[PDB]
C-alpha cells in the first residue's frame with residue numbers, strides 16, 4: 650500500500666515559491682543535498698563510537714553522485730544514519746516549521762534563495778532542478794521506505810521492495826527537461842569544487858559509459 654499525505658501549509662508554500670520564482674543560480678541545490686548527506690554520515694559515525702554494532706549494516710562512510718543521461722536522473726547516495734518512517738512523515742517536518750517560516754520572512758525582506766541552507770531547509774532546493782524527487786532510505790531501527798513528491802501539496806510514503814541498501818539514503822532527482830547540464834561530468838565537478846570542497850567524506854562521481 651501507498652499512503653498519501655498533505656505537506657504542512659508553510660512547506661507547500663516554500664515548495665511553490667522555489668518552483669515559481671525566476672531565479673537563475675539553480676546549482677546551489679547540489680551543495681544543500683551533499684551538506685544533508687554529510688550531516689547523516691557524521692551522525693552514524695558519532696553513534697558508532699559508543700556502540701560499534703551500528704556499523705554492522707555497513708562500515709564504508711561515503712557519498713556517490715550518479716548521473717544517468719538516458720533516464721534524465723541525478724542520484725545522491727550516502728551511507729549515513731538513514732531516516733525512519735516517522736522522520737519522513739512528520740518529525741523532520743515539525744523541526745522544519747520554524748526555519749521554513751523564517752526563510753520565507755527573509756525572502757520577502759530582500760534575501761535570495763541561495764541562503765535556504767542557513768535556515769535548515771536546503772532539501773527543498775531540489776525543486777529548482779527536479780520535477781520529481783524520490784528518497785529511498787534505511788535506518789538501523791526501521792525498514793526501507795520510499796518517499797516521493799512532484800510537489801503540488803502532497804507526498805507519498807511506501808515500504809520499498811527493490812534493491813535493499815544496508816543503511817543510508819538515495820535521493821533520485823527526476824530533472825526538468827531544461828536542467829540536463831547537471832548530468833554533465835565537468836559541470837558536476839565544477840559545482841562540487843566551488844560549493845563543497847571541505848566535506849569530511851569521499852565524494853565519488855560515477856562516469857556513465
Ligand SMILES: OCCN(CCO)c1nc(N2CCCCC2)c2nc(N(CCO)CCO)nc(N3CCCCC3)c2n1
Pocket residue numbers: 681682683685686688689727729730731732736737741742744745769770771772773784796817818820
Ligand atoms: O538531502 C536529502 C536527503 N536526506 C538524507 C541524507 O542522508 C535528508 N537528510 C536530512 N537530514 C540529515 C540526516 C538526518 C535527518 C536530517 C533531512 N532533514 C530534513 N529536515 C530536518 C532539518 O534538518 C527537514 C527540512 O528539510 N528533511 C529532509 N528531507 C528529505 C526527505 C524527507 C523529507 C525532508 C532530510 N533529508
Ligand SMILES: [Cl-]
Pocket residue numbers: 686689690727728729730731732816817818
Ligand atoms: Cl542517510
Ligand SMILES: [Cl-]
Pocket residue numbers: 803
Ligand atoms: Cl492528488
Ligand SMILES: [Mg+2]
Pocket residue numbers: 682683685686725818820
Ligand atoms: Mg542528500
Ligand SMILES: [Mg+2]
Pocket residue numbers: 686725726727818819820
Ligand atoms: Mg542522499
